[PDB]
Symmetry: C5
Subunit: 221 residues, 5 copies
């Protein structure tokens, strides 16, 4: 057992564009359970440097939980084994029409401060020879989202990934997000949100389809 076919095509398409998240070569595969205990040991050190009482039955289990978050939960997208099982249906229908999946739940983490990014993604495409399974779009968005991210990079990764799998450039990706390092810290902007949009094919070059997406982006319920 290794990786997957669709995971490989996406990975190589992204490396070819320099869109991979800053990752150094694996070298050796240390035990997953050892990684957690070492990170937990390092977080125990951090908390003691901040004058926190680890003798308390609540702050005691915290280093274990931060470690379990880093390795098995929030950064699961760095491992291509967690890549969704892509299912493409043959365009028997000759669908020359558009599909838009709006308000996709996007949960990420800013690579600059390891703080939460709450977002919504809108993906639209025009089927060429294949129609992707609906949930797979939500799963691709979430795969790249669960990584230490940069919103502009993230938007591109999702675009190129969908472009590769569908064999069409006619894909559009928009991510409307709130970065908590902007909101709950620093400038403390309680009302601002960032939208980063990547247009491809007809959504870019042709004037027509460019305005067909951009207007239908930003929806509430």
């Amino acid at each position: 057992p290794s990786l997957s076919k669709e995971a490989a095509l996406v990975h190589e398409a992204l490396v070819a564009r320099g869109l991979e998240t800053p990752l150094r070569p694996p070298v050796h595969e240390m035990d997953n359970e050892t990684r957690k205990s070492l990170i937990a040991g390092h977080m125990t050190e951090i908390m003691q440097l901040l004058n926190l009482d680890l003798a308390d039955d609540s702050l005691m289990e915290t280093p274990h939980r931060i470690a379990k978050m880093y390795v098995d939960e929030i950064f699961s997208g760095l491992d291509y084994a967690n890549f969704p099982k892509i299912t493409l249906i043959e365009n028997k229908m000759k669908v020359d029409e558009m599909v838009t999946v709006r308000d996709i739940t996007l949960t990420s983490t800013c690579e600059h401060s390891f703080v939460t990014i709450d977002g919504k993604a809108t993906v639209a495409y025009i089927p060429k020879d294949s129609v992707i399974g609906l949930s797979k779009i939500n799963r691709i968005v979430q795969f790249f989202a669960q990584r230490p991210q940069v919103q502009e990079r993230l938007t591109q990764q999702i675009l190129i990934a969908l472009q590769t799998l569908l064999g069409t450039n006619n894909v559009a990706v928009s991510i409307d997000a709130v970065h908590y390092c902007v909101k709950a810290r620093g400038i403390r902007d309680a009302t601002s949100a960032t939208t980063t949009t990547s247009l491809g094919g007809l959504f870019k070059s042709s004037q027509n389809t460019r305005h067909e997406f951009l207007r239908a982006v930003r929806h509430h319920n």
Copy 2:
């Protein structure tokens, strides 16, 4: 007593495009109440395999209800005898005007998992030689919706159906829908929805009428 003229034209039109829902030869005719008792019998087996007590006063009538649902209710659009009796008014008013029927109640079932699809349809057309009865648009939408469906196929079926009966390519169909196999299971995206839009004639080729529909797409109340 057999079928209907309008139902025949639509059927032939969809078959010619490869849009007729995956159906195998119906060579024989087994009694309607026999198919319900057999499906009920098969559902009684499924429930026993799930460790559910069928001796309970409410779980007891469940296999008969799922049987009655599949045969007489939710999949009624598989039978062209249930096709709406279309009324066409002759356009002696000669109007080159646009009619849009939005927020059409659409109740379907995903063919991939037999789970609920809650949706809303938007149909727009420019009358040529005939004006269709308003309710028949709502009924056509629902006829094709009461089938094990794929959202992209459903949209095209309603388009081609309305294009055939009205004798114009000038028809636009958009379906906004929530798939419960996406929302209440799997990826569990509580916020996402999918819009599939089929543009034909002036709504497709001509630049003007394309943005006339797409802007008036998705309205709330």
Copy 3:
């Protein structure tokens, strides 16, 4: 005492287009109070054929009310004597700019089943040599609405009526409506509404003024 000047120009402009609601020649003039008693008598028979107790102090006055409604109230627009007294001010200001009267209360009745149509109208025009009085637009919409109507014909009757009175083709009429024969009966579509738009002049031919109206159509409060 006969009819009106403005009523005549409109009537003949609509007859020349085949837009006047399908009516047969009146031949003789039958007493208005006799037509009520006749209709009331026919409704008393309909109610009897439905097992209703006419000896009841409430259902007793119902035939009289439905008679009063059909002759003096809801169908008053079939009588051109009820046509609004139109007043036009000369364009001394040389106004080559637009006027839009949105959310006009439209109360009609479907010709198909004599059931209530609840609508809202949006009328826009560009004054040429005359500016029409504001309430006269509301009254024109209501004159043609108080008739057994078809939404597509209703929209056109308002359009041509306004076009004739203003001496310009630069008029746009849009009616957004809920038909209770679609909502509270048959298909029972609780959420759907129908929008019928008739564009004229620059709102039709010219690309610019076309999307000036259509965008500012469908407003809530």
Copy 4:
């Protein structure tokens, strides 16, 4: 002491287009308090002819109030001495940007029935050689509004006045209003509102700037 420079340019610009009363030779006449006493006297007569008890301590002061209203309050826009003191800042910013002042409180009276007009104005312009003081746009709208008005004329007066003061044709004025002579009387349309828009310069001729304004027109809060 007489008038003002800014009041004079606007006055003649409007007279030149038939939007204002031409300046006639300086007469002289009544004392402002004699005008009120005479109007109050005529209102006392009107109320007597309507069988109202003027001996009651409430309806007693009504003729005096309607008199004060007509002379000093609601029609103060008829006297150019009440014209706002306009301040123009030299554009050595040299900016080719656009300024939009929306939802400007507009309180008028229809000249047809002396009944209240509740409106909201939206003004946009592109600075050429000068930038007008913000509040002055609101004050100009209110100057022309406090008069017996016609919505279409009111829109043109504000347009030309702003065009003259700014030395640019690049101004757009839009008034969204509810006439109470349409709402609380006659047709009794409780839902309608009228929008009258005047476009000049690039907001008219150029297709680009035309849709820049008209889209950002009609905002709530």
Copy 5:
């Protein structure tokens, strides 16, 4: 130590366009704390001339607070030492697509009357060779907001500043604001709001990108 590189490049770019004051001080080295006591002394005199009792435990500390506000807080943007530490990420991604930061908290002051301006800023740009850090856009808007401003000037100061740092003309700035010198005094317009928009590069010249921003401007939550 004294200033910043990115601060100097922006200052220079603004002086070159007449949007800033030529940096000429050090003044006669007035101690930060003596400027406060002198301003507090001048405000004590103003309050005395308005006949307010300074012996009251509440009004006593007011001159000190207004001084502290003027010197250390609300006018902090007049000193380029307070300019944010800009971070530019190299465009490794070759991203030819857009970033929009909407609903930016903007807190300013009427240069005309020293009164509060409550605003929201919307900044958009297409990254050329650099991607600026998200919070920096918020921080730049607030730097220029924290000084006695003129909204049309503020909008441009932000545009040019971002155009300079990013090395692109493709930047769009829109400020939506409520001036309390218009709302709570004078004309007393409780509902008006002023939007000032500055479009550069593709957002101005090219017709596509101009309508991509202006449509996505003015968002609530």
